[PDB]
Each structure stands twice: as structure tokens, then as C-alpha cells.
Amino acid sequence: PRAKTGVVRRRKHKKILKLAKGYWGLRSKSFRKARETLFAAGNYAYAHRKRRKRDFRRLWIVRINAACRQHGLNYSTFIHGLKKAGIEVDRKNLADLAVREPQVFAELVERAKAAQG
Amino acid sequence: MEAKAIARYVRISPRKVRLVVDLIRGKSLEEARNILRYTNKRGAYFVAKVLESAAANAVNNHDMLEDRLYVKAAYVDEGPALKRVLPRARGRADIIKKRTSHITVILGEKHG
Amino acid sequence: MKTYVPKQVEPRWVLIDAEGKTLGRLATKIATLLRGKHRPDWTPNVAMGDFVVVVNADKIRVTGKKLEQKIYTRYSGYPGGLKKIPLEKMLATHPERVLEHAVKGMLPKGPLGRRLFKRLKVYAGPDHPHQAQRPEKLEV
Amino acid sequence: MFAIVKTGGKQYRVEPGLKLRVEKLDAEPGATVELPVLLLGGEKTVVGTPVVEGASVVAEVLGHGRGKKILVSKFKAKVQYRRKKGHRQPYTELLIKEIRG
Amino acid sequence: AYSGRKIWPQKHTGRARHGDIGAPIFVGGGVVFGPKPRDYSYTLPKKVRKKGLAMAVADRAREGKLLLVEAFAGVNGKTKEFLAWAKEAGLDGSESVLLVTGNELVRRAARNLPWVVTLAPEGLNVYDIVRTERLVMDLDAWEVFQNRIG
Amino acid sequence: AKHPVPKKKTSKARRDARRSHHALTPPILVPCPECKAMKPPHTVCPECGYYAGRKVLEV
RNA sequence: CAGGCGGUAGGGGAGCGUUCCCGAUGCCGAUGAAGGCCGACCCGCGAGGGCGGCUGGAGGUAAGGGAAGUGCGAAUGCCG
RNA sequence: AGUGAGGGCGCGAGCGAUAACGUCCGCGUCCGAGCGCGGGAACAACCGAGACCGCCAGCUAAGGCCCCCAAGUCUGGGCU
RNA sequence: GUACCGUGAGGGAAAGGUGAAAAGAACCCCGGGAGGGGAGUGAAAUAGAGCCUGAAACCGUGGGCUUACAAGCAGUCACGGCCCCGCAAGGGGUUGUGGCGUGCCUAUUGAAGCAUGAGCCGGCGACUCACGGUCGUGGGCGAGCUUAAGCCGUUGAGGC
Ligand SMILES: [Mg+2]
Ligand SMILES: [Mg+2]
Ligand SMILES: [Mg+2]
Ligand SMILES: [Mg+2]
Ligand SMILES: [Mg+2]
Ligand SMILES: [Mg+2]
Ligand SMILES: [Mg+2]
Ligand SMILES: [Mg+2]
Ligand SMILES: [Mg+2]
Ligand SMILES: [Mg+2]
Ligand SMILES: [Mg+2]
Ligand SMILES: [Mg+2]
Ligand SMILES: [Mg+2]
Ligand SMILES: [Mg+2]
Ligand SMILES: [Mg+2]
Ligand SMILES: [Mg+2]
Ligand SMILES: [Mg+2]
Ligand SMILES: [Mg+2]
Ligand SMILES: [Mg+2]
Ligand SMILES: [Mg+2]
Ligand SMILES: [Mg+2]
Ligand SMILES: [Mg+2]
Ligand SMILES: [Mg+2]
Ligand SMILES: [Mg+2]
Ligand SMILES: [Mg+2]
Ligand SMILES: [Mg+2]
Ligand SMILES: [Mg+2]
Ligand SMILES: [Mg+2]
Ligand SMILES: [Mg+2]
Ligand SMILES: [Mg+2]
Ligand SMILES: [Mg+2]
Ligand SMILES: [Mg+2]
Ligand SMILES: [Mg+2]
Ligand SMILES: [Mg+2]
Ligand SMILES: [Mg+2]
Ligand SMILES: [Mg+2]
Ligand SMILES: [Mg+2]
Ligand SMILES: [Mg+2]
Ligand SMILES: [Mg+2]
Ligand SMILES: [Mg+2]
Ligand SMILES: [Mg+2]
Ligand SMILES: [Mg+2]
Ligand SMILES: [Mg+2]
Ligand SMILES: [Mg+2]
Ligand SMILES: [Mg+2]
Ligand SMILES: [Mg+2]
Ligand SMILES: [Mg+2]
Ligand SMILES: [Mg+2]
Ligand SMILES: [Mg+2]
Ligand SMILES: [Mg+2]
Ligand SMILES: [Mg+2]
Ligand SMILES: [Mg+2]
Ligand SMILES: [Mg+2]
Ligand SMILES: [Mg+2]
Ligand SMILES: [Mg+2]
Ligand SMILES: [Mg+2]
Ligand SMILES: [Mg+2]
Ligand SMILES: [Mg+2]
Ligand SMILES: [Mg+2]
Ligand SMILES: [Mg+2]
Ligand SMILES: [Mg+2]
Ligand SMILES: [Mg+2]
Ligand SMILES: [Mg+2]
Ligand SMILES: [Mg+2]
Ligand SMILES: [Mg+2]
Ligand SMILES: [Mg+2]
Ligand SMILES: [Mg+2]
Ligand SMILES: [Mg+2]
Ligand SMILES: [Mg+2]
Ligand SMILES: [Mg+2]
Ligand SMILES: [Mg+2]
Ligand SMILES: [Mg+2]
Ligand SMILES: [Mg+2]
Ligand SMILES: [Mg+2]
Ligand SMILES: [Mg+2]
Ligand SMILES: [Mg+2]
Ligand SMILES: [Mg+2]
Ligand SMILES: [Mg+2]
Ligand SMILES: [Mg+2]
Ligand SMILES: [Mg+2]
Ligand SMILES: [Mg+2]
Ligand SMILES: [Mg+2]
Ligand SMILES: [Mg+2]
Ligand SMILES: [Mg+2]
Ligand SMILES: [Zn+2]
């Protein structure tokens, strides 16, 4: 029995060019140029999920830090208060009431100042 | 309501003729006539015929009146290609691609 | 839950003075004031820093033998295109540039940095046309 | 009034009548859960060290789900190594009823 | 069926290299490992054969579906007559049957049924025995069957 | 001449980008003051044969 | 409950899909087969399988098994 | 089965000119196959560390904490 | 075994499909025609003869988002804007700024490599079969196991 290629080879090229929509020029038109481009975007995904994680942390720290310096002290200390003060809030919520509820954060500088020494 | 004419298998290269069709898109019917009547390009002729055969189809088949017409849209699709060998130096040969067009014109009544 | 993103700002204007301040160590704070990393909601991808006005930029001071041992360079494009410019050569000629230029080198390069540099206004002497905006005597 | 809470690895700022979603918990699609306050701000302010000693957020487990696909994809060039994995993450939607205390 | 020739030279053409157009890399060229003719048969161990034969026969015997006839009155050549005799065994067509007998007449009467397969006694084989829901066997056909196995 | 040659297929977006200037410009025209038909300036209107208000050729 | 899970040459395992056969005098099908175009939906780790809408207009082939011209992106590949 | 073209760095020797990103052995390691991740600006094999998938959560590692660029223009004693 | 190519011996293509029925589009209009517009046939004319289905590259017209102080393996993670589908919450398309980012294959001690291959797309394309071995293995029989050619039967029946 002979089994000609038929539907199969095209169907699989279809499945790709679907994913490749939005790509510039031939990266969305040719299969062979889409699949390359997709590979790349594939690893870029992965590795950026990770990177995204530290980059929101990164942001938060700046904002916490920026809030702190309005109350004289920096961030590098502001932590050490909080840490030996037994508080356990994370940076996201820290940078939250930082922006949103300044009176609570400003309260949090107190426990910190009182503690660190 | 819109009228439509299409001339197919016109033995002239779409690139060249499209240049013309672009000059009259959206223009009034009377506008276009003069623009074609005095365009220094071979295309115009062909474009004109369709444009005139378009107008006729308007009044004689689609009920609409002559003095309201305009190029609602017009385009040039390409068609088959007469392929012909041109002999080159050192006995190599080429292929001359003699293209062809499918000109269309869509005429429309200016409402009001 | 998602991180707060600021809506549109009403950027604070700032006057800052420059007699006696060290060239560099002043600039670095302009730069952070420029970026707006001093503000509690600072966002990396937006103009939302501060407007900065500088008076007495002539009066800027620098240690060492910098005052004429430092040389700024500029590349004209041609063969022999490198021009070399001493420090005060620059000063008493275009005092403005000296602090001006030490800051651009502290702002991120590309579209946003270029925009942020734009908000910095630098002047020799004690004068500035911006009574309009009523700039604040920021006193770092 | 608000509260910080901590369920599943992380922390969130709740509030009564919030549609929030965390990780796959265990109460059947309709039960309840007491969830620990790390700090109870609001009009009051209560800082937890680590945790506020009495306060508690009762939340209504709405139901459980699976997040949209994620195409984990890997590829090393000139070795022809390529893998494709798909990931639907499970979760739970919580109705924030009230903040105790 | 082509020329043996090198279609162009080896080097300096600029085109890739090639041999004769018969090369399976071309269109029209040969097949690489295309199916020649073959003999898909093998000798099954004669013992395993007859062991399968019984095993299948008795399987039906367990199901009850095996019926032993010793005579068919109404049949002689026409189908209708086999069809009326069928009623006795409760052979209505609600179940496919393997009709085994020596009597050519009976075979000829019933073969034209969809729900029935005719068969000479020697022709008993495990295939036909399994594709059929039932089994109906002439008393002395069953003789040779037994005589066959051991 | 060692016979120069294109390095890379000129991209779609790059060729059309070149043809930015190719577009035609419609003829410039004026009514013939008698026949009001369309005609290019400074030429004798082919509809009647008038220019400068005088019949010039017997169209 | 505890622990393992980077990986080329390579070894082992488990799968999906194409063609044809038994299942088939069967079942599906003009109340629309195959193929084609979409999808932001369901299932699977994936290869894939379904579902729905437009096209198309006569074929298709189950559970369970079988046998191969069975899966392309590169061969200065071959044909267009 | 594949392999029988290895390479770099540390150390120990021969060769070389106490030349080479040299060469050849020995003992280690890593790249090879970890051109996946953090530092070293960049930088296969140097320092940190062996990536199953997910997280807008926490501690550290080398390296750093004036702005580009996350963290001290930290504190106490000196020298240039 | 033709066109066509070779003095020649010899080489050697591509080219199937309207529809059940030709009912193959009279007639009018535009045009030199070609080709279109109505009209008519048909179940369908997006079945019109360049005729079933009609993929992909390739070329257009219309629309949405978009771009003229910004340096780029063309992606990606985030935020925002605009335009659609939606109770909702959401979701689709686009992309402004920001973060990050050394194509694919092969050869390689080592490649983004200024080393090889590929203009793009569709189709054809490479570990088979026969005899003989040798391991594992699923079964039959077991101090035994097994038939070959062939003969009898049969027309997908097997038995000697
Ligand atoms: Mg903490
Ligand atoms: Mg209209
Ligand atoms: Mg006219
Ligand atoms: Mg009327
Ligand atoms: Mg600073
Ligand atoms: Mg000096
Ligand atoms: Mg000179
Ligand atoms: Mg300016
Ligand atoms: Mg003054
Ligand atoms: Mg319940
Ligand atoms: Mg309450
Ligand atoms: Mg021959
Ligand atoms: Mg020969
Ligand atoms: Mg070539
Ligand atoms: Mg050929
Ligand atoms: Mg074979
Ligand atoms: Mg009965
Ligand atoms: Mg039979
Ligand atoms: Mg022009
Ligand atoms: Mg079948
Ligand atoms: Mg059938
Ligand atoms: Mg129906
Ligand atoms: Mg349908
Ligand atoms: Mg289909
Ligand atoms: Mg479907
Ligand atoms: Mg529906
Ligand atoms: Mg349509
Ligand atoms: Mg079938
Ligand atoms: Mg099967
Ligand atoms: Mg495939
Ligand atoms: Mg290639
Ligand atoms: Mg070449
Ligand atoms: Mg080439
Ligand atoms: Mg060719
Ligand atoms: Mg060996
Ligand atoms: Mg060897
Ligand atoms: Mg070694
Ligand atoms: Mg070594
Ligand atoms: Mg020495
Ligand atoms: Mg790197
Ligand atoms: Mg990787
Ligand atoms: Mg590294
Ligand atoms: Mg490496
Ligand atoms: Mg290991
Ligand atoms: Mg340390
Ligand atoms: Mg940094
Ligand atoms: Mg100091
Ligand atoms: Mg110190
Ligand atoms: Mg002290
Ligand atoms: Mg001849
Ligand atoms: Mg016929
Ligand atoms: Mg008549
Ligand atoms: Mg005529
Ligand atoms: Mg006609
Ligand atoms: Mg018609
Ligand atoms: Mg009709
Ligand atoms: Mg149809
Ligand atoms: Mg349509
Ligand atoms: Mg065609
Ligand atoms: Mg014709
Ligand atoms: Mg298009
Ligand atoms: Mg367009
Ligand atoms: Mg750009
Ligand atoms: Mg760059
Ligand atoms: Mg708009
Ligand atoms: Mg829209
Ligand atoms: Mg939409
Ligand atoms: Mg980096
Ligand atoms: Mg190797
Ligand atoms: Mg080579
Ligand atoms: Mg080349
Ligand atoms: Mg090629
Ligand atoms: Mg070429
Ligand atoms: Mg190809
Ligand atoms: Mg043997
Ligand atoms: Mg054995
Ligand atoms: Mg035994
Ligand atoms: Mg025994
Ligand atoms: Mg015995
Ligand atoms: Mg025997
Ligand atoms: Mg028979
Ligand atoms: Mg047969
Ligand atoms: Mg026998
Ligand atoms: Mg015999
Ligand atoms: Zn006139």
C-alpha cells in the first residue's frame, strides 16, 4: 500500500502559521521563517516569566525606598527594622500601602525605627 | 446600487496600467473622462473603454442616471502571462514574461 | 492582585543652585530628580520625573587638576574630526554645557532618556525665565 | 477597611466582597475558609508580628478552575533539541465575605 | 525505463550533481524500497492448527450456539425450503450461522443467505467458525471433524 | 568589472517604498472659452480650432 | 509520605497521525461524505482528537485487531 | 551502541627562547553535551550555581550598594 | 516512442475531470474586436468551457490599529492608548514607552559568525524485502519437535 503525503504536511504547516500571526514580513507568511521565529519567541517566553518576577520586585524596592526617604531614612535600613521587628509583609503589599495608604506605611517606619536599635 | 464593468485578458502589464487607474479613483464620471482623454499613457485607452462601458451598464441595465456617476472603486488584477523565449549571448536563453490585466471599474450614483 | 499604576501627573518644578557644588555629585541627584526615582510611585516607562532648573552653572566647582586637565571630545565625522576641549575652555565660552553634559551621561540613552533630558533647564548666573512656572527652591 | 492575607505562597490585599483568586485550596465549591491577617489596616491599623494574633478573614470558596494554557517551549540550536509542554494551572476563586476584627 | 547517461557534467555546471534521470531522487525515477512481489504465507505448526479447530468448536459449544443436526427434512434445493426448516432451529437470521454439511443440495439451498455461510466438512477452519454467531453441523460432517482432530 | 550583483532579495516593504514617487499627475486643463470643453492650456482646442479667440484650424 | 526529573553521539520505554485489510450484505451520509477556510471553545504533557460557523457536493468508515511506497526545512536535492 | 579530530584553565615535567590562544605527557576539573541562569561591560570552559512546569511571594550566592543600574553618597582608623 | 533535440546511433516530454441532461447562454446594451453588463438555462454559472474541489507562495482593492529625533535576528515580558466581541469579569486586533534579546541547519575543540546549504511556496524524496543466522520474546508440543517438493480438496477451506 502506498501512503501519499496528502493532507498531513499542509495541516502541520497550517498549525504554525496560525501561531505566527502578527510577525513582520515573511515571519508570518513563510512556514520556514515562522517556525524559526516561533522557536525564538518560545524561549523568550520562558526566560521572561522568570525575569518578570525579579523586575516587579525591582520596581517595588525603588518605590518602597522612595517612600522611606521622605521619612529621612533609606530602604537598606528600613528593612532591618522590619526584619528584627518581626513583621513579615512582602514587598508587593509594602509598595502597595506605600502608594495607596501612606499613613499605614508611615506607621510601619515607626515599628522599624523603634526596633533596629 | 452600483454598476460594474470588467475587461479581462487585456494584453498589458498591470503595473503600467494600475498607474492610470489610480489617477481616476473616486473621480466624477465626467471628471475621469477628460483625465483619461488627455493622459499621456497607453493604459488610458483600455481604462477608458471599461470606464465608458461601465457607465452604459449603469444607465441601460441598472436604472441609474448618467450625470450622477463616479468611480466608486476600480482596480487592476493580474492575469496569465504570455511566456516567450528571448535568445541571449553565448547561447543562453531567457524568458520574457508578457503579463496581462483584468481591469475593473465600479460606478456609483452620488446619493443627493 | 496588581501593582498600582499612576494616572496623569502634574509635574513639580524645581529650582536648584550651583555655586560651590561639586560638578558630578550635584549632577547625580539632578539625574535621580530628573528620572523621578524620588517619587513614591515612580514608573520606568513614563515621563513623570521633575522639571529641573539650574542657576549659577558657571559657578560649578571641581577638584583635582580637572579644571584644565579634563578634556571633552567631539567627533566631526571627517578625517581629523576629533576636537579636544579643555575644561574652562568650555566654561568661559559655554558654561552651560559643563553641568549640562555631565548629566546626559547619567540618563538612560534612547527615546525616554532623551525626553527626560529635555526637562532640565541650565543657566549661568542667578537668573531664569521661569517665574512663569514658579519653580521651587529645592535645597539639596 | 482592608487586610493583608496569606494563602498559597503569597500575600494579597483583601476587602469585603472581593472576587479574588488564589491557589487550589480544599473546601468544596461552596464552603468557607478562615484566612490569616498579616496586617489589619483600614481605619484601624494593626501590624502583624509576624501575624496578628486574633484577626481572621472568612472567605467564600466559590469554586475551582484551571488557568489558560501556557506554552512552555524549549529549544537548543545545532543539537536539534526541542521540547513542547503545555501548562494549565489550577486555582480557586474566593468570595471575600467579611474581615473578623 | 530511461537512458543511462549523465544528464550533464559533474562539475562547473553550477547545477547540482546528478547521474541518470532514473535516479529515485527525480520525479519519474525509480522507487527506493517499493514493494516487490511477496509470499505472505507460512507453515503454521500442523498441531496448533487442529488445536485451534477444537478450541473454537468447543468455544461455540460453551456458548450453546453449536447445534448438531442429523437430518434436514424440508430441504432439497430451493431456498424457501431451507428457510422454513430454519424455523425449527430458531434460525431466523437474528444470528449469523455457519452451515456445515456434505449434502450439496442443502448447501446450494442456503448459501444465498446473508446471515448464512455454507461450507463443505473439510473446509472447517477456525476463521469461519468465529465470524459466525452460530454453528450448525451435519451429524456425519461432525464425524469427520472429530476424526480430523486426533 | 567583476560584475556586481544583488546581495539580498529586496524586501516587499522596501520596493513599494521606492515606488513612493512613481505616481502620476493628472493633466492640467482649461475650458476652451467658446466651447467650454476641456483642453490643455496654450494649445489650440481640438474641438473647434480656436486660440486667442480666432478660428485657427477648421476642426 | 520520601526522593529523582539539564543534556549531544547513543540505549530503553510509551504514544499520535497517514495508506490499505478483517470487522462490512454492517453503520454513517443530499436533514450534506471527503477535501477546503476560520475560531477568542472542549480534551491531551505533547504529537493530536473533537466541537461550532462559511465553503464543498458523494463519499466515508467505528470499538478491537492486522500489513506497510507512513510523517520533511535544508541533500549547489527533482518537478512545477 | 556511539566513541577512537577534543579543548581550556590549575598544578607537575619534557620540547621551545622560564616565546606563543605553541607542543607532548601526568593528576585534577569544567566546556564538549550546561552557547540554559547570576557576576566578570562584551566574552564555550574565570568566580556563583547543575534550569520538570507555574507565581506581580520569601533567604541567600559570586559580585556589588553616586546616576546610567537593584542596594549605604552607611559608620569608625589610616595612607595616596 | 509523438512534439522537440541530435548528422547520426540515440535521447525524449508535458497534456485526465462543465453538467444528470448542451439544455453550451437567442435577444438588447458598451465595445473594432477581445471582454463585460442585463436577459435566459440549471438544483448550483463564486459549474461558463482559460469549465468539479480550488490549498501556498505571489499581486491587488477596501477597512481597523499604526509610523517622519530614532539604531533594528524583528521577537518577547510589562504598562498604557485606540478599535472591535461581550451583563459581567473578561476577551480579540494593534503598538507607544520600558525591560530583555548573537537567525536555522550542517560541520565542529569551538559559530551570530566575515565557514557549508537554502529566493519563496506546493508536491516527489532516503534504513526496505528474500534467504541464512543470533539474542530476546508470545504461544504449540515436549525426550521429543517439525515437515519440504508434491498430491486430494477449494475458489479468499483446508487436509494428506
Ligand atoms: Mg521580607
Ligand atoms: Mg452602492
Ligand atoms: Mg463618451
Ligand atoms: Mg426609473
Ligand atoms: Mg541618587
Ligand atoms: Mg584643576
Ligand atoms: Mg587633513
Ligand atoms: Mg531643553
Ligand atoms: Mg537678571
Ligand atoms: Mg457547600
Ligand atoms: Mg467585617
Ligand atoms: Mg534505454
Ligand atoms: Mg556509458
Ligand atoms: Mg545552483
Ligand atoms: Mg529533468
Ligand atoms: Mg520491498
Ligand atoms: Mg428454535
Ligand atoms: Mg465460503
Ligand atoms: Mg510623477
Ligand atoms: Mg473496510
Ligand atoms: Mg461501502
Ligand atoms: Mg438537520
Ligand atoms: Mg453545511
Ligand atoms: Mg473536512
Ligand atoms: Mg471542522
Ligand atoms: Mg452554535
Ligand atoms: Mg465568502
Ligand atoms: Mg474502513
Ligand atoms: Mg489499526
Ligand atoms: Mg509532519
Ligand atoms: Mg540548506
Ligand atoms: Mg550556485
Ligand atoms: Mg547559490
Ligand atoms: Mg527547471
Ligand atoms: Mg563499536
Ligand atoms: Mg580506535
Ligand atoms: Mg579530556
Ligand atoms: Mg584536560
Ligand atoms: Mg625555568
Ligand atoms: Mg551570554
Ligand atoms: Mg535552552
Ligand atoms: Mg555566563
Ligand atoms: Mg559552551
Ligand atoms: Mg550531572
Ligand atoms: Mg557577600
Ligand atoms: Mg544593574
Ligand atoms: Mg562621606
Ligand atoms: Mg569609609
Ligand atoms: Mg561609632
Ligand atoms: Mg529530427
Ligand atoms: Mg456526459
Ligand atoms: Mg431582435
Ligand atoms: Mg458593430
Ligand atoms: Mg459578448
Ligand atoms: Mg446573467
Ligand atoms: Mg440567473
Ligand atoms: Mg455550488
Ligand atoms: Mg463567495
Ligand atoms: Mg487557471
Ligand atoms: Mg476564447
Ligand atoms: Mg493580501
Ligand atoms: Mg492593504
Ligand atoms: Mg524604531
Ligand atoms: Mg542597541
Ligand atoms: Mg479613532
Ligand atoms: Mg474592530
Ligand atoms: Mg475584534
Ligand atoms: Mg545583561
Ligand atoms: Mg562533537
Ligand atoms: Mg564542506
Ligand atoms: Mg550561496
Ligand atoms: Mg533549494
Ligand atoms: Mg536561482
Ligand atoms: Mg522545495
Ligand atoms: Mg532454517
Ligand atoms: Mg524459543
Ligand atoms: Mg514441560
Ligand atoms: Mg510428561
Ligand atoms: Mg512421550
Ligand atoms: Mg509433523
Ligand atoms: Mg464457494
Ligand atoms: Mg479474492
Ligand atoms: Mg490430513
Ligand atoms: Mg496424499
Ligand atoms: Zn473650442
Keywords:
part of a larger assembly, 6 chains, C: 140 residues, alpha/beta, 4-stranded parallel sheet, two-stranded antiparallel sheet, 5 helices, 6 strands, D: 101 residues, mainly beta, 7-stranded antiparallel sheet, binds magnesium ion, binds zinc ion, RNA-binding, ribosome/antibiotic, termination suppression
Question: What this model shows, in words?
Answer:
This is part of a larger assembly, with chains A (117 residues), B (112 residues), C (140 residues), D (101 residues), E (150 residues) and F (59 residues). Chain A has 117 residues and is an all-alpha fold. Chain A has helices at 7-19, 31-68, 75-84, 91-99, 102-116. The longest helix of chain A has 38 residues, at 31-68. With 112 residues, chain B is of the alpha+beta class. Chain B contains 3 helices and 3 strands, in the order βαααββ. Chain B is elongated. In chain D, strands 1, 2, 3, 4, 5, 6 and 9 form a 7-stranded antiparallel sheet that branches. Chain D has a two-stranded antiparallel sheet with strand order 7-8. Chain D is mainly β. Chain D has strands spanning 3-7, 10-14, 21-22, 32-40, 46-47, 56-66, 71-76, 81-86, 90-100. Chain D contains no helices and 9 strands. At the A-D interface, helix 2, helix 4 and helix 5 of A face strand 2 and strand 7 of D. Bound molecules: magnesium ion (84 copies) and zinc ion (ZN). Residues 98-99 of chain D line the site of one magnesium ion. The structure holds 3 RNA strands. Chain C: One of its GO terms (biological process) is negative regulation of translation.
Oligomer: part of a larger assembly
How many helical stretches of chain A? 5
What order do the helices and strands of chain A follow?
A: HHHHH
Order of helices and strands of chain F: HEEEE
Tell me the major beta sheet of chain F: 2 strands, antiparallel
Strand content of chain F is: 5-15%
What is the CA–CA distance across the termini of chain F?
58 Å
In helices, the fraction of residues of chain A equals over 70%
Cα radius of gyration of chain F in angstroms: 23 Å
Please summarize what this structure is.
Chain A is mostly helical and 117 residues long.
Write the layout of secondary structure elements.
The structure is cut from a larger assembly and holds chains A (117 residues), B (112 residues), C (140 residues), D (101 residues), E (150 residues) and F (59 residues).
Chain A: H1 7-19, H2 31-68, H3 75-84, H4 91-99, H5 102-116
Chain B: E1 2-10, H1 14-21, H2 29-37, H3 43-61, E2 69-87, E3 93-109
Antiparallel strand pairs in B: 1-3, 2-3
Helix pairs in contact in B: 1-3, 2-3
Chain C: E1 13-17, H1 23-35, E2 51-55, H2 66-69, E3 71-75, E4 82-86, H3 87-91, H4 95-104, H5 111-118, E5 120-122, E6 136-137
Parallel strand pairs in C: 1-2, 1-6, 2-5
Antiparallel strand pairs in C: 3-4
Bound molecules: magnesium ion (84 copies) and zinc ion.
Residues 89-90 of chain E line the site of one magnesium ion.
Chain A binds 3 RNA strands through residues 1-15, 17, 21-27, 29-33, 35-41, 43-62, 65, 74-77, 88, 90-92.
PDB class: ribosome/antibiotic
Keywords: RF1, termination, blasticidin S
Entry title: Antibiotic blasticidin S and E. coli release factor 1 bound to the 70S ribosome
